[PDB]
Swiss-Prot record, chain A:
One of its GO terms (cellular component) is cytosol. Substrate binds at residues 95, 105, 133, 218. It comes from Thermus thermophilus (strain ATCC 27634 / DSM 579 / HB8). Catalyzes the oxidation of 3-carboxy-2-hydroxy-4-methylpentanoate (3-isopropylmalate) to 3-carboxy-4-methyl-2-oxopentanoate. The product decarboxylates to 4-methyl-2 oxopentanoate. The record marks 140, 186 as: Important for catalysis. Pathway: Amino-acid biosynthesis; L-leucine biosynthesis; L-leucine from 3-methyl-2-oxobutanoate: step 3/4. Belongs to the isocitrate and isopropylmalate dehydrogenases family. LeuB type 1 subfamily. Binds 1 Mg(2+) or Mn(2+) ion per subunit. InterPro entries: IsoCit/isopropylmalate_DH_CS, IsoPropMal-DH-like_dom, Isopropylmalate_DH. The gene is leuB. This is 3-isopropylmalate dehydrogenase.
Amino acid sequence: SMKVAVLPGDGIGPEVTEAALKVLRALDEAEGLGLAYEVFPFGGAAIDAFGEPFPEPTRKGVEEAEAVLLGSVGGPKWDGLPRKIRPETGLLSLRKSQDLFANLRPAKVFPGLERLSPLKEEIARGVDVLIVRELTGGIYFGEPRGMSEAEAWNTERYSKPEVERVARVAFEAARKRRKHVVSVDKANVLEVGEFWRKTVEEVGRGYPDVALEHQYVDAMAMHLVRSPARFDVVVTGNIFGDILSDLASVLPGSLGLLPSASLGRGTPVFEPVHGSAPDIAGKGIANPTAAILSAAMMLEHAFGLVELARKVEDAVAKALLETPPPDLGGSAGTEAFTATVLRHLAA
Amino acid sequence: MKVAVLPGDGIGPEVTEAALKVLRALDEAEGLGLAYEVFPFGGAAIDAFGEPFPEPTRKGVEEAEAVLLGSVGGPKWDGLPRKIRPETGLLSLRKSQDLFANLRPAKVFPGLERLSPLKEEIARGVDVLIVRELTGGIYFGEPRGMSEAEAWNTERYSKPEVERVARVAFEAARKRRKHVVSVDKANVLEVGEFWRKTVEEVGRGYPDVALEHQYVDAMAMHLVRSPARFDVVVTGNIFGDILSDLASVLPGSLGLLPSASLGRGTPVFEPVHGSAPDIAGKGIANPTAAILSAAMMLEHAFGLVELARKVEDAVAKALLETPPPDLGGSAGTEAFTATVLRHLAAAALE
Ligand SMILES: NC(=O)c1ccc[n+]([C@@H]2O[C@H](COP(=O)([O-])OP(=O)(O)OC[C@H]3O[C@@H](n4cnc5c(N)ncnc54)[C@H](O)[C@@H]3O)[C@@H](O)[C@H]2O)c1
Ligand SMILES: NC(=O)c1ccc[n+]([C@@H]2O[C@H](COP(=O)([O-])OP(=O)(O)OC[C@H]3O[C@@H](n4cnc5c(N)ncnc54)[C@H](O)[C@@H]3O)[C@@H](O)[C@H]2O)c1
Ligand SMILES: [Mn+2]
Ligand SMILES: [Mn+2]
């Protein structure tokens, strides 16, 4: 029915993950999802227990599952250690072993939460944009690449199958939202841009259901500050995606609000944007919105349950208004806010 | 003082004319020996000659001390073959003169915070100069090309290329707040890493100037959350295109953003906005970006810094007193130009 690997890891990870589970448990019960999950050691919580960051039962409970609900990893106790044993590269091994080529990051400014944004209210109102970013190609992994005394070079390269697959994801995401996709390239100057555009156009042919439009990267940066509310789904290569999803991530005005999904060949991974936050670890104050919204994401993208995920979304939106956490100017601790999410979910 | 005026298309002529009106006034007051000549460029040139950058305009440009440039393009030209695009005309202008350094200041004038997309508290005091490398990087790098299977472009810089654009930004910061942010991707890319190490090497020649490094993705967050923290920013061609474009929307009207392009040949001065065909020939275009560009011209082409700052004084005051329509006021191009000229006369007869 619903098989889930839970990797809470380090710091606030365990706390915010436990919060998501309450929500998932509340759902399973009232809706009958047949939720099956197990908990797996990960990051520094595993380096202490299995001399490794991403160990034997975890590697395999990952392959076995239909989805991975990740907390966050790293901390104070684990600083300045090898690329071998590093928590932050356990993340990279996890993400690679599943061949995850697409990163989906939504920035939503919730009703009533306009004041938080660094944009003026008028501009901030009604922003909900899903940036989809190609993740295993582009300039970051392109060749030729090198450096000498005299110069350095790097290659932004994309092949047809790399653009196609990421574009379908974005197209499939659009079918479940508002049926509008914007594709981002540098088509007026670069051969890769023009190749990107044309391929996404070819893929679009199979989705006349979805409105498709093309924006250049430099002008996309003007639009996300000037009128971000105009967008639904946005798809782009790796470096532009990095740049523009980071840009969009600031629009809501709190890091604790940001969920992430990573899709591909293997087992999908849902996780908060934020880190293990050892500065506020175990003070009972960590805002679980990001992990819960990661659980929502897990429902829509790994299991087909789109109406259910919108329920979790609507529950979370109402709670942020009613009992805002400290990072929002509010006063509600993790526990009390989760209970607020459940009151709304029980209605 | 020998200028080549390249008015261009749409509002281009309109706003360039207002810039000239400010210049003739200055020439009268101060005795500049201003000499200028008007050349076809962009769509205008395509209609008369079939190419965006004719030999006659190439020669005018080569032979003057500065170019004052409006803007190019419009529906009549936009989707044309490449050899003859308004856009290609631009690249040809910049390459001919080898203008490697694109200087783009974004300023929220005292009292104009309400205009910004950003909350008043965050737009307050913003004044950031993006120094963008203009002749190199991924946009001109080889190998490049496309087949049915794949496509590739090459982000690459060499040492003397990073060095000279670096020098320009340190010299710029030295006449400002003495703070440079260099921007790379040193954490993932070889080119980032080389960019960074080379800027540090140039930084040692400017001990009075504080030098800091930021990744492009991070910069992009920082320019929205805390843009007022920055003085000078220096970066490559694509990151510069992106970040300076981002910064250009912070003031809240593209009517307000001037720019300079400086290199080996004749420097080019131009508003950041396009040809605004929605409003062209309606007499409402804001001439600020053009007037400020002519002020950049006076400092960087002619060493008339105190004049350039006076011009910026008269503009800032006029913005407040009689705002143009893009600021919520009613002041047409000419009416606004007059207000500027009156504050210029008034501040000078003191
Ligand atoms: N995606 C990731 O897993 C990730 C990302 C960045 C950093 N890290 C790692 O985590 C550790 C901390 O680095 P960091 O502090 O820059 O990342 P961080 O997200 O933990 O810290 C960001 C800041 O925002 C606050 N914050 C973060 N999440 C919050 C939440 N859910 N509710 C309320 N406040 C919240 C933190 O207290 C901190 O001041 C480091 O070891 C770093 O390497 C991990
Ligand atoms: N430097 C350049 O030459 C340059 C830059 C950008 C676009 N373009 C070209 O110009 C056209 C672009 O039209 P566009 O709408 O995308 O960009 P645009 O900058 O011309 O217009 C953007 C918006 O700002 C308004 N606006 C711009 N300048 C103004 C001013 N000085 N005063 C008052 N309002 C102003 C316009 O009316 C429009 O609504 C195309 O042909 C494009 O190729 C040229
Ligand atoms: Mn990033
Ligand atoms: Mn641009």
